[PDB]
Design a protein around this ligand. Structure first.
Ligand SMILES: O=C(N[C@H]1CCS[C@H]2CCC[C@@H](C(=O)O)N2C1=O)[C@@H](S)Cc1ccccc1
Ligand SMILES: *[C@@H]1O[C@H](CO)[C@@H](O)[C@H](O)[C@H]1NC(C)=O
Ligand SMILES: *[C@@H]1O[C@H](CO)[C@@H](O)[C@H](O)[C@H]1NC(C)=O
Ligand SMILES: *[C@@H]1O[C@H](CO)[C@@H](O)[C@H](O)[C@H]1NC(C)=O
Ligand SMILES: *[C@@H]1O[C@H](CO)[C@@H](O)[C@H](O)[C@H]1NC(C)=O
Ligand SMILES: [Zn+2]
Length: 698
């Protein structure tokens, strides 16, 4: 007995670890290169990917399973499954889609008050009866597209069992407000955006047999850009939306009318009319004392002088465009190709992913429980669920025990933190009844009826369905049994309004987890993920919500002040990271703070749980071909979760839009703060990976 594990499962783990690492790099100088340098040398980002790495590879591999389970009818399939497969088949039939051209979009445009640039005599046909209230509400209520003013039904932050109407600033056509500077690194994207507008307007006019005036098209679409630039500059930055206590402003609709008046197309904007135009689609009446949560009061105030300068036509040119730009990829090849330069500018990709991949993901996104059922029956093992349950119990207890060691909280706040940690609701794998209750699964989709030659009608039906569902919830209680993710997902989640952590079946696989892989690897993989999600209940957002999901302050003044002091260290740390792929720009340490807190706390929680495991059960057998002990393998597996790279165009995008740090800096930043990492690899003091100053929250 040489002490070495020689099982097939140890062999597969060892081979993967060996192939990804670059042992010629000193781990204490750059652990990203040490852990991932072999992967980087062997791989090139595919033409269809904006990012590539071990996470993206797992998602690509999950898509293969979805293809296998969606593409073949089975006699015993229940109606829910038949519908998912029919939807899939409608999506992959490009011949049927191509033969329809843009006709499905042409049929639809009268229902959204047209697109003026592709309409003759727009003012007479649609301007005559146009109102901002009706035009915005139509896009919202029927198609789920929120333009200018984002009104939605969501959970009440301060009463987690109830729903309430929210009003917020809208999303933009470009990835973030920064893009609307339209200079330097943003210039290509802005140019491509307007060219994309022009190209689609041109295609529609061609198919409608209208004359093309290239100068007129450019005049109108550049006016769309000038309008959206003003909208973008009026929106609040993410850094100014990160305190949920300050974001929550509840007031009546009468208050909203008194305090946020708008004059659009020369008409006073009626908030009550706007709200009822939306809620009437689900037979719900609204009066002026309805409570509303306004997340963006400053934005509405800034919108007043903006919208007085624009006509109904100018607004509808932007409003319909924001919907159309989403639809062209559901039309014929000619319409699909109009997006090529825009896609390359935002993502760097030169080709769309395989049709069957896009379609598998589309069906999974819209029928998550039907596809989840098919996925787990094909790919998810039995006892896995129970093993992960036990790992969650260990890490939950480690979090609670660590509270005693934390010197920056008083006893009262620690007790409240333990209360919340004990109340976190765990969801593992999949909801049992997507497999065991056919009636319930069929009835979830009963109102959907797909036609296999009508992909466009199918996706439009799905837009209407999911928006009707959302709006109808206004007077209903929150369903505590609902899962915040489908099972066929390679991710994990935390919900502060439900105080719920979820680990879908899709993430319960190597490198994160296998009942047959070494425990060092499981703790460094899924163990860290579990701690990450629990720690989200206590990050700069989650800490503001109590055990029942309510936005209520349970912190003493001193402990809250200390939380900000401790977390400020990480704001500065990650904000000092320069990203070469993003042109040398610095990460946003405020926007990534929550995820960085979760990374740093979660890895430590997982490590301490692994130490307790060894205390109780003894050391594991070593892996063959690796001169690394199991403490070292714990950190190596953590790091290899994040092996990957980015296209420069997408790095410019993600550094502004991603609330996570890039994988390489999740590795460097977290391990820089870990004394245990530097103990395991015997890093000299003030080596790059072992700075004397270390940040710590949880
Ligand atoms: O870090 C997370 N999840 C990531 C998963 C990698 S990709 C990343 C970048 C793009 C935006 C976003 C997306 O997947 O859409 N995203 C995520 O959610 C947390 S919450 C869950 C998790 C934590 C640690 C290991 C594995 C999972
Ligand atoms: C694709 O759609 C066309 C037109 O409806 C139909 O004739 C053809 O059989 C479909 N192909 C498949 C593989 O279902
Ligand atoms: C952007 O918005 C701010 C705040 O309303 C304003 O002061 C500034 O002039 C705006 N910039 C442009 C270019 O409109
Ligand atoms: C909203 O106002 C319009 C007139 O601009 C009116 O035709 C419509 O019936 C109103 N809708 C509701 C729900 O009151
Ligand atoms: C970098 O770190 C220093 C030291 O804490 C801090 O003062 C500075 O603001 C940080 N810079 C960024 C961009 O985060
Ligand atoms: Zn996270």
């Amino acid at each position: 007995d040489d002490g070495i594990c020689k099982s097939s499962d140890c062999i597969k783990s060892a081979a993967r670890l060996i192939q990804n690492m670059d042992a010629t790099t000193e781990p204490c100088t750059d652990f990203f290169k040490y852990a991932c340098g072999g992967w980087l040398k062997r791989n090139v980002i595919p033409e269809t990917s904006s990012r590539y790495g071990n996470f993206d590879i797992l998602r690509d591999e999950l898509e293969v399973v979805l293809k296998d389970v969606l593409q073949e009818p089975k006699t015993e399939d229940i109606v829910a499954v038949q519908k998912a497969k029919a939807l899939y088949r409608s999506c992959i039939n490009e011949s049927a889609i191509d033969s329809r051209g843009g006709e499905p979009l042409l049929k639809l445009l009268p229902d959204i008050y047209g697109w003026p640039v592709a309409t003759e005599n727009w003012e007479q046909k649609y301007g005559a009866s146009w109102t901002a209230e009706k035009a915005i509400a139509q896009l919202n209520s029927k198609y789920g597209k929120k333009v200018l003013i984002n009104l939605f039904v969501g959970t009440d932050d301060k009463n987690s069992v109830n729903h309430v109407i929210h009003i917020d600033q809208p999303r933009l056509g470009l990835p973030s407000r920064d893009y609307y500077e339209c200079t330097g690194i943003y210039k290509e994207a802005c140019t491509a955006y307007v060219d994309f507008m022009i190209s689609v307007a041109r295609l529609i006019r061609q198919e409608e047999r209208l004359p093309i005036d290239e100068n007129q098209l450019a005049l109108e679409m550049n006016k769309v850009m000038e309008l959206e630039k003003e909208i973008a500059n009026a929106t609040a930055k993410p850094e100014d939306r990160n305190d949920p206590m300050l974001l929550y402003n509840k007031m009546t609709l009468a208050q909203i009318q008194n305090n946020f008046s708008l004059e659009i197309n020369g008409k006073p904007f009626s908030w009550l009319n706007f709200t009822n135009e939306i809620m009437s689609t689900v037979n719900i009446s609204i009066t002026n004392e309805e409570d509303v949560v306004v997340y963006a009061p400053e934005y509405l105030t800034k919108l007043k002088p903006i919208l007085t300068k624009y006509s109904a036509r100018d607004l509808q040119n932007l409003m319909s465009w924001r919907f159309i730009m989403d639809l062209v990829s559901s039309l014929s090849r000619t319409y699909k190709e109009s997006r090529n330069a825009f896609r390359k500018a935002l993502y760097g990709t030169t080709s769309e992913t395989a049709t069957w991949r896009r379609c598998a993901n589309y069906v999974n996104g819209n029928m998550e429980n039907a596809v989840g059922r098919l996925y787990v029956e094909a790919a998810f093992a039995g006892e896995s669920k129970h093993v992960v349950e036990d790992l969650i119990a260990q890490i939950r207890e480690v979090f609670i025990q660590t509270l005693d060691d934390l010197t920056w909280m008083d006893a009262e706040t620690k007790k409240r933190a333990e209360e919340k940690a004990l109340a976190i609701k765990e969801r593992i794998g999949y909801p049992d009844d997507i497999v065991s209750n056919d009636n319930k699964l069929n009835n979830e989709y009963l109102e959907l009826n797909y036609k296999e030659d009508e992909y466009f009608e199918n996706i439009i039906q799905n837009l209407k369905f999911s928006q009707s569902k959302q709006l109808k919830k206004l007077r209903e209680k929150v369903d505590k049994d609902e899962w915040i993710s489908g099972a066929a997902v390679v991710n994990a989640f935390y919900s502060s309004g439900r105080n719920q952590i979820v680990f879908p079946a899709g993430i319960l696989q190597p490198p994160f987890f296998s009942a047959q892989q070494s425990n060092s690897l499981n703790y460094g993989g899924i163990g860290m993920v579990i701690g990450h999600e629990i720690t989200h209940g206590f990050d700069d957002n989650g800490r503001n919500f109590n055990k029942d999901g309510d936005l209520v302050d349970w912190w003493t003044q001193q402990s809250a002040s200390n939380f900000k002091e401790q977390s400020q260290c990480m704001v500065y740390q990650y904000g000092n990271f320069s990203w070469d792929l993003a042109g040398g720009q610095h990460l946003n340490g405020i926007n990534t703070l929550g995820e960085n807190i979760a990374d740093n706390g979660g890895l430590g929680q997982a490590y301490r749980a692994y130490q307790n495991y060894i205390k109780k059960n003894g050391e594991e057998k070593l892996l063959p071909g690796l001169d690394l002990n199991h403490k070292q393998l714990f950190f190596l597996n953590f790091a290899q979760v994040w092996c990957g790279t980015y296209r420069p165009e997408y790095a410019v995008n993600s550094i502004k839009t991603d609330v996570h740090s890039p994988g390489n800096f999740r590795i460097i930043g977290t391990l820089q703060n870990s004394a245990e990492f530097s103990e395991a690899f015997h890093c000299r003091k003030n080596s790059y990976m072992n700075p004397e100053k270390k940040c710590r929250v949880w």
